[model samples]
Target: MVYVSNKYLTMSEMKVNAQYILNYLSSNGWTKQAICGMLGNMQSESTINPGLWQNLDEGNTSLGFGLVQWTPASNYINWANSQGLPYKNMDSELKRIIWEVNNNAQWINLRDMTFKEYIKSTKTPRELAMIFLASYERPANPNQPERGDQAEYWYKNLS
Candidate 1:
């Protein structure tokens, strides 16, 4: 697992991550509202840095990794490599995120819950964000309002 040295990233770097999220999801036929939902979480999770890790202590073991800060961070590294994607960068990490949603049962369940309405109708960014927060992130205590605010901001500010 990777140990995060810092919790901050440059603004431009964050923009790159945002754009990549948009492009990747758009190419795969995700709606803008849905992509914004994910973006809102990405912003809160790790400031869009694929290298961000959490729960690192003096001994250097960590609990999470990448933009979404997946737990058991080492597993993410190995899983990414197994999928023929390097686990060292944002692009590959983002790919792994999509792969998990499509393949992993837990993530697939979240995907089903989050985008169910998208198949038949469009949703607002807030609607999509709440689904992702509850079904995918699944944190014990969540900042629902902040995620909603971020979703709205991204939808209006970013393409």
Candidate 2:
């Protein structure tokens, strides 16, 4: 865990988290597009900074927090605490992401496919990135067009 836990990371630091996510997902059977697409979303959400809180809502447990910015951040925090996992860093949050992807039913209707199905689909990295953004991390600004290219960046550079 190469964590800059107190603040958002420089790209050089974020690179480690990005590579971790890429390797973790791909080794767990996620495809290039699938992993990169999600990495793109994580970059936008938290710069892959696990301990980050939403800048505007900084340190407020009820606001966005963690890699995926679980709104009402305590939702993830509390769950992690219950599971005896460290909640303030990227490693646990990464596991939480997988947990939600497999267990959270909320993603199905948005993408019209199961998380498993989505990962295996032949969608381009861009399309899958958008699917992940609009579906999983539906932020206030849902028009994150940059995520697609971000996905390709990881796909190009990391794969």
Candidate 3:
């Protein structure tokens, strides 16, 4: 994992975070290809806008409101809503991001734990993504752990 400064996350930093988050989602329930598709959407011209969701009111349709391309159904949105984000209102959306670390299960666990602990526990980005994506694609077999398979990148163990 890369260390980002406190001033604000740079584009590269956002990419890293996005990768980590999306990887986790793919492993949990989101298709690996769909995760890749969303990343591809992140590169669209409309995605260049800084005020992504805000620009949605103006008809901007970039991946993730012109940012890393987060969509409403993504685990992130579910987590945000679970944490009380309005989702529809642009201003509320902005604040939701600020509270992301708190709302995001994967990020919060990793952020709270020591880096070594996080890395040792989080083998791949996909494993981390499941922490949130599981909300959408929970394990089909709860008899086993829901951590998911690092190989298949899918939570085949939840019910």
Candidate 4:
């Protein structure tokens, strides 16, 4: 009935792409209930933009938009550079947010892995968000080989 392309469009084009993503997922066994659940999970615990409200009204509220909310932090800018994104503006910021969404193999693991399993998972959200926000928290003495070590490693490694 309707065919739209993202090849040539303005900022408004993103909304269409967002709608397409939602529609595609809903049609592919990704139920609205699942979306709502993920939204709730992301809203409550997601490190997108801490201390923000979610009224489900597409409000900016200092967070860009859509499922993954991105901040205009310098850390993100650095990543955009490392990732080879040309634009050094908000528009590129938005595109980088989308890139993160597609490349969140790390987040999926973080969500699916158990806390105990996370100890040796080697793929921590701390590692992922750290690259975005510069500093992150993790278990201390990660290189240690203690049979019974129970500590949350929170490193402040930032460049």
Candidate 5:
């Protein structure tokens, strides 16, 4: 019998999944470390696929949606609308992630870092990924062990 981690992603796969985000963040001046952090979270959330969803039809009413899986449906819709982005698209969701980091109260620390400065202070991609997980994602599982692996993968393979 063979055992493999469910969260593994190939470099080529990540490149295809995250090219838009990489280009947007890179061209806009984000360091490789910061990009890795964001990519880690996105990969964990939805494999960078914008159309992913959870619990939408389970009668749970509350559900996770899109790249970051913004919960309760309303949050997903309102956030996209607030950013002047239409829901259900990759470009819009990527922009929403950036806008949320800059404008959302929960992400004040990230905003305060001035985007580039934060990356400068981050000694490792995993460190930045943990910071992003704690401050922005606020998921039920903050540990997100997969992020560490993915961050390292991105830093070494992609950057």
Candidate 6:
């Protein structure tokens, strides 16, 4: 993990976090498309900033937080603290993501697939980003182009 002066990050720092996320997920059996899909969506959520509060409103558990913007922030806050890790710890959040995938089983939401299927998917970054957007993230906006383009960026740069 790189140095984070605070929750907020510069653009380059955000990209560095992207690469770091790439490395982490790739080593953990995630295919390029899948990792980039998640990365692109995460960028939209929090600029890949691990310590950030959604909408820059800190300590608001009712809002989202961190890389994946886990809503009602206490969901992650409580989980991480119970795990004996700081809520803002980058790697800890990533681990919690895996825990969510394996344990929470959000993969099946609005998708006819499993986590194994999703991660190993050979879909284009854009298509897979759509899957993550709809199935995993399910944000209120459900925008596509930006997330798709960012996923394409990750596909080109991180691979």
**Per-residue lDDT of candidate 5, residues 1-159 (tens digit):** 111122334556556767566677777667777888877887787676666665334222268766666777567677778867777777777676666656644464643454435545555888777777776678887678788678777777663
Candidate 6 error regions (>4 Å)? 3-10
lDDT winner = 6
What's each prediction's TM-score? 0.80, 0.90, 0.29, 0.26, 0.75, 0.91
lDDT of 2 by residue, 6-42 (tens): 4777777877888888777776677878888887887
Query: Which segments of model 3 are wrong by more than 4 Å?
Result: 1-11, 45-51, 54-83, 86-159
- Would you list the C-alpha lDDT of every candidate in the order shown? 0.67, 0.79, 0.37, 0.32, 0.66, 0.81
The model with the greatest TM-score is: 6
Total clashes for model 5: 0
Better of 2 and 6 by lDDT: 6
Error of 5 at 1 (Å): 37
Candidate 6 lDDT trough over 10 residues, lowest sum = 1-10
Could you give candidate 1's per-residue lDDT for residues 81-130 as a string of tens digits?
A: 78787776767776775666566433434445633444223577877777
Model 6 has an lDDT value of 0.81
Model 1 / residue 144 / CA error / Å: 3.2
Model 1 vs truth, CA RMSD = 4.2
CA shift of 74, model 1, Å:
1.8
The true-versus-predicted C-alpha distance at residue 97 of model 1, in Å, is 2.1
TM-score of the candidate numbered 4?
0.26
Q: Which window of 10 residues has the lowest lDDT sum in candidate 1?
A: 53-62
Error of 2 at 85 (Å): 0.3
Model 1 misplaced regions, further than 4 Å? 1-6, 10-12, 55-62, 108-121
User: What is the per-residue lDDT of model 3 for residues 104-127, given as tens digits with 9 covering 90 to 100?
Assistant: 422334234432233234334344
> TM-score ranking from best to worst?
6, 2, 1, 5, 3, 4
Over 1-99, each residue of candidate 4 has an lDDT whose tens digit, in order, gives 111321223324333333444354455344333323222222222221222223332333343222233342344545667878743333353455345
lDDT of 1 at 116: 44
